[PDB]
Amino acid sequence: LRSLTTVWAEHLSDEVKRRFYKNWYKSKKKAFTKYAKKYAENNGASITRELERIKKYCTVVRVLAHTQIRKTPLKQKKAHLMEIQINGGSVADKVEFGRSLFEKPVTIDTIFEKDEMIDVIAVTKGHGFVGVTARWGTKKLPRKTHKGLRKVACIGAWHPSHVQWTVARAGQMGYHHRTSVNHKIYRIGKGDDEAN
Amino acid sequence: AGTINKPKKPTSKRKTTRLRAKISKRAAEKKRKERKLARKNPEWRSKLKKDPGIPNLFPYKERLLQQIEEERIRRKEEL
Amino acid sequence: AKSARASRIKENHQRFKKNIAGPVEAARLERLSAKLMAIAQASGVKSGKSIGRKDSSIVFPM
Amino acid sequence: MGRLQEYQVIGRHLPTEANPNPALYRMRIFAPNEVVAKSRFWYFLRGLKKVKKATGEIVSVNVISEKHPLKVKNFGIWLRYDSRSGTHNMYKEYRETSRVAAVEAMYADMAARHRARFRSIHILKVVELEKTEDVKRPYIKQLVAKNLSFPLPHRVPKISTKKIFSAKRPSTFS
Amino acid sequence: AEINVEATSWRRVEVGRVLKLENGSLAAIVEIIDHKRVLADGPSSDPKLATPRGIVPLSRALLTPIVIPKLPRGARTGAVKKAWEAYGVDAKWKETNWAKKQLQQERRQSLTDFDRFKVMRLKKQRRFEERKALAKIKAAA
Amino acid sequence: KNLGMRKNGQVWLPAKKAFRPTKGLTSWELRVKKRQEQAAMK
Amino acid sequence: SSFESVVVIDGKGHLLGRLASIVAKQLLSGQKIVVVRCEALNISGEFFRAKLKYHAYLRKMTRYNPTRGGPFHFRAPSRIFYKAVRGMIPHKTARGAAALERLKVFEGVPPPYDKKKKMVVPQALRVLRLQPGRKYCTVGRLSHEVGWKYQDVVARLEERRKAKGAAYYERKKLAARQLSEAKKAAAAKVDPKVSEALAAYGY
Amino acid sequence: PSEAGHRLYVKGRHLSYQRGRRNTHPKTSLIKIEGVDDTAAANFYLGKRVAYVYRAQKEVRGTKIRVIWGKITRPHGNSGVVRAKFTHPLPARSFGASVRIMLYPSSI
Amino acid sequence: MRYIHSEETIPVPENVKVSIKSRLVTVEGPRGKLQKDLSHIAVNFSVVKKGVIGLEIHHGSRKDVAALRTVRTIINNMIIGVTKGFKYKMRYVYAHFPINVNVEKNAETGCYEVEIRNFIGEKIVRKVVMAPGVEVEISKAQKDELILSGNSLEAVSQSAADIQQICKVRNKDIRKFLDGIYVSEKGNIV
RNA sequence: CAUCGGUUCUGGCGGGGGGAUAAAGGCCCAGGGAAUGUGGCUCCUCCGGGAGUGUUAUAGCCCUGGGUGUAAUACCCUCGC
RNA sequence: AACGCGACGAUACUACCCGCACGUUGUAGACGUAUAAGAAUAGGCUCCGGCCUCGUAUCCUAGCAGGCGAUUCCUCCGCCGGCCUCGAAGUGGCCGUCGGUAAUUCGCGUAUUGCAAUUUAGACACGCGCGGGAUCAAAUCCUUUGCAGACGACUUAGAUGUG
C-alpha cells in the first residue's frame, strides 16, 4: 500500500497544531497557514484536484482525526492524531463521506455500540530493567546460591558456542505495544447525562 | 510422506578425504583378497567354455549352417 | 481435542458467522452508519476536474 | 569407435625348414588405421590359431572400400559382447550406406545402450540384407515401409550462439 | 456432421521434396534413410544451386514448397536430372520468397562505399516522395 | 445397441482394439513363410 | 554481439538458471540489464520439486540468532531470480558488486519499461530448450505458495497494461496501413531511374 | 546541417587479463570487439592499434584525458575475443570499460 | 523405440458439431455444448473423412502413442454426453433413522444443492453443492432414490462421488451399520 | 613508416606421387533379375483411392562384364609460391 | 531494514526557484550509446489480397564537428503556450506561434594541425558567479512533568493561558 495524497481541512485547531511542534510556546505557529490559502485560491482548485485524484486512483480511504484533549483533566495540551479507515461503500462514497465529515466532531456512540466486542490497542505499563525471574517467570535458584539466585543457572550447556536468542535474559520489561481482542462494551455513557 | 512440505536434513554428496582414502584402501585390499581366493579356488572349471552359438534372428543362419556342413565335409574328405 | 486450526472447527465457525452473528452485526452496522451519516450531512485544468500534475530511480541514468 | 576403415589383413607364420610354405590367414578388421588393424589381427590370431607376432609376419594390408556408398542399405550385425555376467550374443540392424558406417553406428549403439566398450565387443558377422523381407527389427521395418513420408513437428530453428538477444520470439514450425 | 479443425499443416519430407541447404544450394530427396537423414541429389545446371548426390542430415536442411511429382525412390542422377529439368525446379525456386530474400542479401552485401552513399541519397529522394504521400493521406483522414 | 456387459459398469465405453503399435509392418503370408523357414532351420 | 545502453529482457518463458548465467556474463562484461516479468519465469521439472527445493532452502537459518547472518529467504520472484544471478557473480568483491549494480529486476512491467523494446534470449527459452512432454513450473506460482503477497496486484496491473497495449496496437496497425498506402501512392511519383537503381542495389 | 556521427573506430570492451584458474598475467589483456564473433572475423583486426581513453584529475599539457596505447596481437578462443598488448598493462578497475580499436595500420 | 506415425479415429454423429482450435475441443449436440482443453497432450487433429476426426502423433514414444487412446475416449464421452447424456441413479438405505434428502436449486449460482438430514440420527445437516450442469431429482418410480443427470460424465460422476463420500460411517463396525447413499445404476439419459 | 635478420602463429594458391593406378558417379555397349511393381488390364469404393496380375510400356531400380579412362574427387604422403 | 520506501506541514541564512557563465568538480566508463503489441509454439500474423527459418530488419544517416549566399521545398526537428491525458517508482497526445531545416542544383570558403598521436565535443550530479523572482522557520541545552527511566532516551508543560 502507498499513500498517494492527503487533503486537510481549511481550519485546524491549536490542539492538533501542537502535534507538529516540539516547542509550540516559542513557535510562530505558522503550520498550515499557506495550506489554508488553497481554499481561497481559484475556488479551491488544488483541493478539488487532490480529491478527484483520490476518487479515481485510490483503493483505501482513511480520515485524519484528533482527540480534544482539552476536555480531559490531563495537563497535556498537544492532541493525538491518527488515521481511521472508512470501510464500506465505493471509493467516491468514502471521499464524499470524509469531506462531509471535515471539521466536524464525531462522538464515540456513532462508531461503537453497547454490547459490541472490540479490540483495544495501547502501550503497556513500563517496568524498567528487570531480571529474568520477573521478566520471564523462571524458577529461583536455592538460597545463598553463589553469584545470585534470581538467575538462570545455565544459559548454555550445548553447542553452538554462542548464547541463543531463545534464552531468557535480563532487560526491558513492559512498555510494549499490545493488541488485545474480544472486549465487550458494557455501557456507552453520555457526558451530559447527570445519571450516566 | 510429507517430504515436499517438510523436508528433512539433506544427505550430503560431498565426500571427505578420510572416507575416500579408506574406500580406496578397502577396494585394493578386496582386489588382492579376491586374487588370492581365485588362486586357491577349488571349484571345478571347464577347459573349453560353452559357446552361445548363432542367434536365431540372424537371417542367414541356415546358410551359415550349410557352409559349416560343407566345410566339415571337405575337411573329412581331405583328412 | 480439536485444534483451533482444525478444518471442522473452521467450518463450524464459518456456519456460525454466516447464520447467526452476521445479521446481528449487519443491523448494528446499519444503525451506526445511519447515525454517522446524520452527523456527516448535518476548464478542467483551471477547475481541478481534470487531474493535472501536482505542484533513487527506477531507470539507469540516460 | 572413430573414423573407421575396413582392412583386409593377411598374415602368416614365419617359414621354417619343416614348413617352408605356411598357411595364409585373412581377416576383415574395422580399425581407425593400419597399426590398429595389424594389432587387432595379431590379437585375434593369438586367440584362435596360437600364432604369435614374434613368430609371424604380415603379408598384406589393403583397404576394402564400399562398392556403392550412394546406395541405401540395411545391415545385419551379429556380435558378441562381454559384460560382468559373461559373453552374450546379439543380432542388430542398421540402415546405412556402408559397412563401415554401420559398424560405427553399432559401436555408438552398444556404448549408449549397454555401456560396452570397444575392447569388449567382438564383431562376428556384418551382412547386407538382400531383401526387404530379411529385415527383422521393427525400427528398420517402419523405415522400409511403402510410401514413407513424415513431417517434422517442433523444429527448433538454428540461431547463432553468439547472437545473445533476439527482438522476436522464434517459431517452431519449419 | 460438421467438423471444423484448425491445426498445423507441416511440409513433409518425402521422395521428390526439394531441400535448401545452408550454403544456398538445392537438392531433391531420393530416399529416406531414417528420421534424421535422407539421401539427396541436386542435378541443377546452376552451380550455385547444385548439390552432389549424398547423405543430407535433416537438421541442416529446410523444406521448400517444391515437390517433384512422381520421382521414383532410389532414382539415379540421370533420372533425377530429367525430372528436375522437366518440372523446372530452378524457375519455381527463383519465384519463391526464400530466393528473393537471398538475392536481396547478396545485393546488399556486395555494396561498396560509393554504392552505400548512392543508396542513401536515392532512398532520401524516394522517402521524400513517400513523406508527401503520407502527409496527403493523413490530411484526408 | 450393446448386447454384452462391461465388468466395471462403464457401459458407454467403446469396443476397444488391441494396443499394437507395430501393427502393419509385416504381412501375414510373409510371416507364415518365415515360420516355415525358421522351423526348418531349428 | 552488440553493445547497448541497456537491454530490457522479457522474463516470460525463460529458464531461470540459463537466463541467470547469460545475464551474469553480460553484467560482468559490462552491460546493463533490466529483467521484467520475473513472475513468468520457468523452472524445468515438476512443481513439487521446486517447492521441495524452496522448503529445503527455508530450513536453513542461523541457529543462535535469526536476525543476523542467516540465509534471508526472499519470496518475491524477482528476488528468486536475483539470488540465481548473485550465485554466479563474485559478489563479495568490488568488481562483483559493481557488476550487480548494473542489474534491475521487477515483477510485471513497471513504467517506463512498458513502452520500451523487450528482448528475448533464445538460449534460455523454454519452448526452444525443453523436450516436449517434460514438466515445468512457474516462479510466480512458487512465490505465491511460499508467501509472496502481490500475485493478484501484479495480475490486475498487467491486465491494465495489456489493455493499453491493445489500444496502442490498434493505432500501430492504422499507421502501418497508412504507410503502405503512402508507399503505393508515391511509387508512381518517384523517378523510375531511382526505382531501378534502388531495386538493383537491393532496396 | 550534417546529422551524422564521426566515429572512425570500432568499439571494444576490456574483459580480463590473460589468466588460468587462479594466476593472472596483466601483461596481456582480453578484448571483446563489437560485432566480432569468430576467429576468422578476428583475424581482420590483428595488428590494429587500440586506445584506452580515460579521465584524470589535473590538467596536464592542455587536457584532463589520458590514453594508453596498444595493439591487437592474436585471436583468443573461438568466439572472436582477441588478445591485446598495451604499453602499460591496463588498470584492473577497467574490466568492463570501453576501448577504441582503430582501423590503422590499414592493409586495405 | 520411436514410432513414425500413429493414428486414431473418432466417428461423429450427424447431429453433432465438433470444433477444434489449438487443441481446445468444443462439442455441440441436441442436449447442449461441452468444452475441453487438451493442450497438455501433443496431438495433430485433422479431418480424414466426412464425419470422422483423425488424431495422430509423429515420432512419438510408446507413452505418446498410448495417450491418443485417452484423448479418443474423452472426445467420445463428450459426444455421447451431448447426444444421449449421462445418468447416475443412487439409493439411500438405513436401519432405524430415515435419511431425509432435500434437493433445491440455488438461483444465485445456478447449481443444485442436496441436503442430507438424520443420517443415523445425527443432528448435523450435510450439504453437497452439485457441479454446474448436473440436475438432481428425487425419483417417484422407486423408493429412496436420487437421479443425477447431465452432459458432462465427469461432473455427474464426481457429484455422485461427493454425495457418496459425505455420508460415511465413522468408528463403527461397517459389517453391522449399513446406512449410506450408494451409486446403484449408471447409464445414458436417452 | 619502409627495407631486413631471428623465432613463431595463421590464411590462401600452383604442382607431383600412391591405393582396386581410389572406390563411386555421368554417358554409351552387352547380358541377367526382382519389388516397397511404372504403364496397361481386371475387381471394389466414400469416387478419394485400395486389391490383384505381371518385368518397362506413358516411371524407374538392382547384379555382372566392357568402353570413355592413365576420368574426376575424397584420404594419405610430398615439392614449392 | 538505524545505508528500504511513500504522503504531508513549515522551512530564517551564504538557505529556495528561474536565465546563462563556466569549472586542474565528480561518476565501474556517451560517441546514432534510435526501435512498446499481446499471445501460441502439435501453431500464428494480416491491409483479408495474402504472409511467417532468418533484426542479414526498420528508422536515421551528405554540408567548417558541418560556414556564407542563392536555387528550390512544405518535408523533418526543437522550445514555449492552450486543451486533454498519464499514479507500478506518474508523460505523453493534439492544436497554435516562433526558430531551424539540400527532396533538386550551384558559387564562394576550407590549405600551414606540415605523414599518425582521445575526434578534449554526451548525460547526470556537485560547486563557484551574476541578474531577477519568492520566503521571514525550527531544533537542542535549560526549567518542568512521571503515563517514563540505571544513564541516555521517552510522555508532557514553559510566549497572557481553561497558563
mmCIF file with all atom_site columns, C-alpha atoms in Angstrom, chain G residues 11-98:
data_model
loop_
_atom_site.group_PDB
_atom_site.id
_atom_site.type_symbol
_atom_site.label_atom_id
_atom_site.label_alt_id
_atom_site.label_comp_id
_atom_site.label_asym_id
_atom_site.label_entity_id
_atom_site.label_seq_id
_atom_site.pdbx_PDB_ins_code
_atom_site.Cartn_x
_atom_site.Cartn_y
_atom_site.Cartn_z
_atom_site.occupancy
_atom_site.B_iso_or_equiv
_atom_site.pdbx_formal_charge
_atom_site.auth_seq_id
_atom_site.auth_comp_id
_atom_site.auth_asym_id
_atom_site.auth_atom_id
_atom_site.pdbx_PDB_model_num
ATOM 1  C CA . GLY G 1 11 ? 11.337 -12.841 -18.414 1.00 0.00 ? 11 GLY G CA 1
ATOM 2  C CA . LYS G 1 12 ? 8.278  -14.696 -19.704 1.00 0.00 ? 12 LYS G CA 1
ATOM 3  C CA . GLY G 1 13 ? 9.010  -18.240 -20.838 1.00 0.00 ? 13 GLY G CA 1
ATOM 4  C CA . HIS G 1 14 ? 12.683 -18.179 -19.823 1.00 0.00 ? 14 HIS G CA 1
ATOM 5  C CA . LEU G 1 15 ? 14.509 -20.892 -17.901 1.00 0.00 ? 15 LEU G CA 1
ATOM 6  C CA . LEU G 1 16 ? 15.826 -19.464 -14.648 1.00 0.00 ? 16 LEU G CA 1
ATOM 7  C CA . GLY G 1 17 ? 19.374 -20.809 -14.467 1.00 0.00 ? 17 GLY G CA 1
ATOM 8  C CA . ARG G 1 18 ? 20.228 -20.362 -18.137 1.00 0.00 ? 18 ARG G CA 1
ATOM 9  C CA . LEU G 1 19 ? 18.875 -16.806 -18.178 1.00 0.00 ? 19 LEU G CA 1
ATOM 10 C CA . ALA G 1 20 ? 20.802 -16.118 -14.955 1.00 0.00 ? 20 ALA G CA 1
ATOM 11 C CA . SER G 1 21 ? 24.049 -17.462 -16.452 1.00 0.00 ? 21 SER G CA 1
ATOM 12 C CA . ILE G 1 22 ? 23.679 -15.325 -19.577 1.00 0.00 ? 22 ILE G CA 1
ATOM 13 C CA . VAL G 1 23 ? 22.644 -12.239 -17.565 1.00 0.00 ? 23 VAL G CA 1
ATOM 14 C CA . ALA G 1 24 ? 25.582 -12.638 -15.154 1.00 0.00 ? 24 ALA G CA 1
ATOM 15 C CA . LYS G 1 25 ? 28.048 -12.945 -18.039 1.00 0.00 ? 25 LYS G CA 1
ATOM 16 C CA . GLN G 1 26 ? 26.594 -9.787  -19.619 1.00 0.00 ? 26 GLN G CA 1
ATOM 17 C CA . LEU G 1 27 ? 26.813 -7.901  -16.304 1.00 0.00 ? 27 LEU G CA 1
ATOM 18 C CA . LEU G 1 28 ? 30.441 -8.890  -15.768 1.00 0.00 ? 28 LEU G CA 1
ATOM 19 C CA . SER G 1 29 ? 31.233 -7.913  -19.358 1.00 0.00 ? 29 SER G CA 1
ATOM 20 C CA . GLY G 1 30 ? 29.769 -4.502  -18.545 1.00 0.00 ? 30 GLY G CA 1
ATOM 21 C CA . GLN G 1 31 ? 26.257 -4.484  -19.988 1.00 0.00 ? 31 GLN G CA 1
ATOM 22 C CA . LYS G 1 32 ? 23.264 -3.043  -18.145 1.00 0.00 ? 32 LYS G CA 1
ATOM 23 C CA . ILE G 1 33 ? 20.349 -5.488  -17.926 1.00 0.00 ? 33 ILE G CA 1
ATOM 24 C CA . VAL G 1 34 ? 16.748 -4.962  -16.799 1.00 0.00 ? 34 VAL G CA 1
ATOM 25 C CA . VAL G 1 35 ? 14.666 -8.136  -16.455 1.00 0.00 ? 35 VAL G CA 1
ATOM 26 C CA . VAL G 1 36 ? 10.893 -7.690  -16.287 1.00 0.00 ? 36 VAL G CA 1
ATOM 27 C CA . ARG G 1 37 ? 8.065  -10.177 -15.629 1.00 0.00 ? 37 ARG G CA 1
ATOM 28 C CA . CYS G 1 38 ? 10.121 -12.363 -13.300 1.00 0.00 ? 38 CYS G CA 1
ATOM 29 C CA . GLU G 1 39 ? 6.877  -13.992 -12.124 1.00 0.00 ? 39 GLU G CA 1
ATOM 30 C CA . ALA G 1 40 ? 6.591  -15.554 -15.601 1.00 0.00 ? 40 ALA G CA 1
ATOM 31 C CA . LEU G 1 41 ? 9.997  -17.251 -15.439 1.00 0.00 ? 41 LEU G CA 1
ATOM 32 C CA . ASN G 1 42 ? 10.039 -21.037 -15.758 1.00 0.00 ? 42 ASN G CA 1
ATOM 33 C CA . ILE G 1 43 ? 11.851 -23.802 -13.884 1.00 0.00 ? 43 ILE G CA 1
ATOM 34 C CA . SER G 1 44 ? 12.226 -27.205 -15.519 1.00 0.00 ? 44 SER G CA 1
ATOM 35 C CA . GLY G 1 45 ? 10.938 -30.275 -13.723 1.00 0.00 ? 45 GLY G CA 1
ATOM 36 C CA . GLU G 1 46 ? 7.782  -30.768 -11.702 1.00 0.00 ? 46 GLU G CA 1
ATOM 37 C CA . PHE G 1 47 ? 6.369  -28.042 -9.473  1.00 0.00 ? 47 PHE G CA 1
ATOM 38 C CA . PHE G 1 48 ? 6.702  -30.172 -6.337  1.00 0.00 ? 48 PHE G CA 1
ATOM 39 C CA . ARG G 1 49 ? 10.453 -30.494 -6.947  1.00 0.00 ? 49 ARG G CA 1
ATOM 40 C CA . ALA G 1 50 ? 10.794 -26.694 -6.941  1.00 0.00 ? 50 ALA G CA 1
ATOM 41 C CA . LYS G 1 51 ? 8.567  -26.486 -3.853  1.00 0.00 ? 51 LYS G CA 1
ATOM 42 C CA . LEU G 1 52 ? 10.713 -29.109 -2.099  1.00 0.00 ? 52 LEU G CA 1
ATOM 43 C CA . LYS G 1 53 ? 13.871 -27.203 -3.045  1.00 0.00 ? 53 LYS G CA 1
ATOM 44 C CA . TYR G 1 54 ? 12.480 -23.956 -1.637  1.00 0.00 ? 54 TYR G CA 1
ATOM 45 C CA . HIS G 1 55 ? 11.373 -25.646 1.593   1.00 0.00 ? 55 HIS G CA 1
ATOM 46 C CA . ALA G 1 56 ? 14.839 -27.198 1.933   1.00 0.00 ? 56 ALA G CA 1
ATOM 47 C CA . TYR G 1 57 ? 16.142 -23.655 1.469   1.00 0.00 ? 57 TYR G CA 1
ATOM 48 C CA . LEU G 1 58 ? 13.692 -22.430 4.141   1.00 0.00 ? 58 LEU G CA 1
ATOM 49 C CA . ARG G 1 59 ? 15.101 -24.993 6.592   1.00 0.00 ? 59 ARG G CA 1
ATOM 50 C CA . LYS G 1 60 ? 18.477 -23.240 6.744   1.00 0.00 ? 60 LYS G CA 1
ATOM 51 C CA . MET G 1 61 ? 18.778 -20.493 9.353   1.00 0.00 ? 61 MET G CA 1
ATOM 52 C CA . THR G 1 62 ? 21.420 -19.212 11.770  1.00 0.00 ? 62 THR G CA 1
ATOM 53 C CA . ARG G 1 63 ? 20.646 -21.121 14.956  1.00 0.00 ? 63 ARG G CA 1
ATOM 54 C CA . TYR G 1 64 ? 21.788 -18.716 17.678  1.00 0.00 ? 64 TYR G CA 1
ATOM 55 C CA . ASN G 1 65 ? 20.271 -15.577 16.101  1.00 0.00 ? 65 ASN G CA 1
ATOM 56 C CA . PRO G 1 66 ? 17.816 -15.483 13.166  1.00 0.00 ? 66 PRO G CA 1
ATOM 57 C CA . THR G 1 67 ? 18.064 -11.681 12.848  1.00 0.00 ? 67 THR G CA 1
ATOM 58 C CA . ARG G 1 68 ? 21.713 -11.674 11.692  1.00 0.00 ? 68 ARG G CA 1
ATOM 59 C CA . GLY G 1 69 ? 23.973 -13.612 9.362   1.00 0.00 ? 69 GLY G CA 1
ATOM 60 C CA . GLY G 1 70 ? 21.437 -16.235 8.377   1.00 0.00 ? 70 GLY G CA 1
ATOM 61 C CA . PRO G 1 71 ? 20.104 -17.067 4.941   1.00 0.00 ? 71 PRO G CA 1
ATOM 62 C CA . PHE G 1 72 ? 17.354 -14.492 4.489   1.00 0.00 ? 72 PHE G CA 1
ATOM 63 C CA . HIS G 1 73 ? 14.696 -16.151 2.356   1.00 0.00 ? 73 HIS G CA 1
ATOM 64 C CA . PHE G 1 74 ? 13.289 -13.779 -0.248  1.00 0.00 ? 74 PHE G CA 1
ATOM 65 C CA . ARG G 1 75 ? 9.960  -14.915 -1.650  1.00 0.00 ? 75 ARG G CA 1
ATOM 66 C CA . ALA G 1 76 ? 9.357  -12.432 -4.486  1.00 0.00 ? 76 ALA G CA 1
ATOM 67 C CA . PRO G 1 77 ? 10.038 -13.870 -7.980  1.00 0.00 ? 77 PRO G CA 1
ATOM 68 C CA . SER G 1 78 ? 12.485 -11.118 -8.959  1.00 0.00 ? 78 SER G CA 1
ATOM 69 C CA . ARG G 1 79 ? 14.405 -11.774 -5.754  1.00 0.00 ? 79 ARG G CA 1
ATOM 70 C CA . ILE G 1 80 ? 14.464 -15.519 -6.508  1.00 0.00 ? 80 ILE G CA 1
ATOM 71 C CA . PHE G 1 81 ? 15.932 -14.676 -9.919  1.00 0.00 ? 81 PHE G CA 1
ATOM 72 C CA . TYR G 1 82 ? 18.290 -12.225 -8.191  1.00 0.00 ? 82 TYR G CA 1
ATOM 73 C CA . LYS G 1 83 ? 19.556 -14.993 -5.902  1.00 0.00 ? 83 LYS G CA 1
ATOM 74 C CA . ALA G 1 84 ? 20.122 -17.136 -9.003  1.00 0.00 ? 84 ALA G CA 1
ATOM 75 C CA . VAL G 1 85 ? 22.104 -14.303 -10.623 1.00 0.00 ? 85 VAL G CA 1
ATOM 76 C CA . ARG G 1 86 ? 24.067 -13.457 -7.450  1.00 0.00 ? 86 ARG G CA 1
ATOM 77 C CA . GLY G 1 87 ? 25.237 -17.046 -7.062  1.00 0.00 ? 87 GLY G CA 1
ATOM 78 C CA . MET G 1 88 ? 27.027 -16.754 -10.429 1.00 0.00 ? 88 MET G CA 1
ATOM 79 C CA . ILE G 1 89 ? 28.809 -13.463 -9.633  1.00 0.00 ? 89 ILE G CA 1
ATOM 80 C CA . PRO G 1 90 ? 31.750 -12.951 -7.222  1.00 0.00 ? 90 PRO G CA 1
ATOM 81 C CA . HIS G 1 91 ? 29.532 -10.642 -5.183  1.00 0.00 ? 91 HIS G CA 1
ATOM 82 C CA . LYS G 1 92 ? 31.952 -10.278 -2.249  1.00 0.00 ? 92 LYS G CA 1
ATOM 83 C CA . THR G 1 93 ? 34.461 -8.413  -4.434  1.00 0.00 ? 93 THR G CA 1
ATOM 84 C CA . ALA G 1 94 ? 34.239 -4.798  -5.556  1.00 0.00 ? 94 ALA G CA 1
ATOM 85 C CA . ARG G 1 95 ? 34.080 -5.872  -9.212  1.00 0.00 ? 95 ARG G CA 1
ATOM 86 C CA . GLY G 1 96 ? 31.231 -8.259  -8.409  1.00 0.00 ? 96 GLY G CA 1
ATOM 87 C CA . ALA G 1 97 ? 29.304 -5.586  -6.511  1.00 0.00 ? 97 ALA G CA 1
ATOM 88 C CA . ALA G 1 98 ? 29.814 -3.182  -9.427  1.00 0.00 ? 98 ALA G CA 1
#
